[PDB]
Amino acid sequence: MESNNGIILRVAEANSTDPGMSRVRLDESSRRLLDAEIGDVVEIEKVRKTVGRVYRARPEDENKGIVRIDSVMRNNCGASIGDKVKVRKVR
């Protein structure tokens, strides 16, 4: 699947501090491609759309093409760990 106005990333599990906080961990490359500041509202899309705020991914995840969202958000958007999802800045 493709995206013209967002990016595609692989879903990974939340950082342990994240569940229930509507956080979307994105690396520097992803944030730059999306023109997303920390705190910007983004959407994760697969079967459905879920919304959350951008959080700085940790150094080990830089340039690994992943987005970290917790199990509730994965259920909301309809993705499993390792699935491709669309990440979109809410304009």
Side-chain angles (χ1 to χ4, degrees):
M1 74 175 189
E2 58 89 48
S3 183
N4 301 311
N5 310 316
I7 61 188
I8 303 296
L9 296 159
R10 286 205 176 271
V11 166
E13 75 188 336
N15 289 139
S16 197
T17 172
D18 288 358
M21 309 291 295
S22 339
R23 289 176 177 178
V24 184
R25 296 281 184 154
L26 293 175
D27 69 8
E28 175 190 323
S29 163
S30 296
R31 263 145 44 215
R32 178 169 55 250
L33 287 191
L34 293 178
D35 191 51
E37 292 209 38
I38 307 295
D40 270 4
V41 177
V42 287
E43 269 191 332
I44 318 289
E45 316 188 4
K46 190 157 179 322
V47 188
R48 281 283 96 109
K49 307 179 193 180
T50 189
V51 90
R53 309 196 82 118
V54 166
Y55 219 91
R56 165 177 285 100
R58 271 169 203 183
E60 56 263 39
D61 303 306
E62 290 284 357
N63 297 335
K64 286 182 165 190
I66 66 172
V67 48
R68 296 184 182 281
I69 45 157
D70 65 22
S71 51
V72 162
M73 298 177 74
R74 300 200 293 277
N75 298 341
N76 293 358
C77 74
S80 319
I81 287 196
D83 284 2
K84 297 304 209 163
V85 294
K86 293 171 281 173
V87 181
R88 188 200 184 84
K89 188 185 183 175
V90 170
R91 278 142 179 90

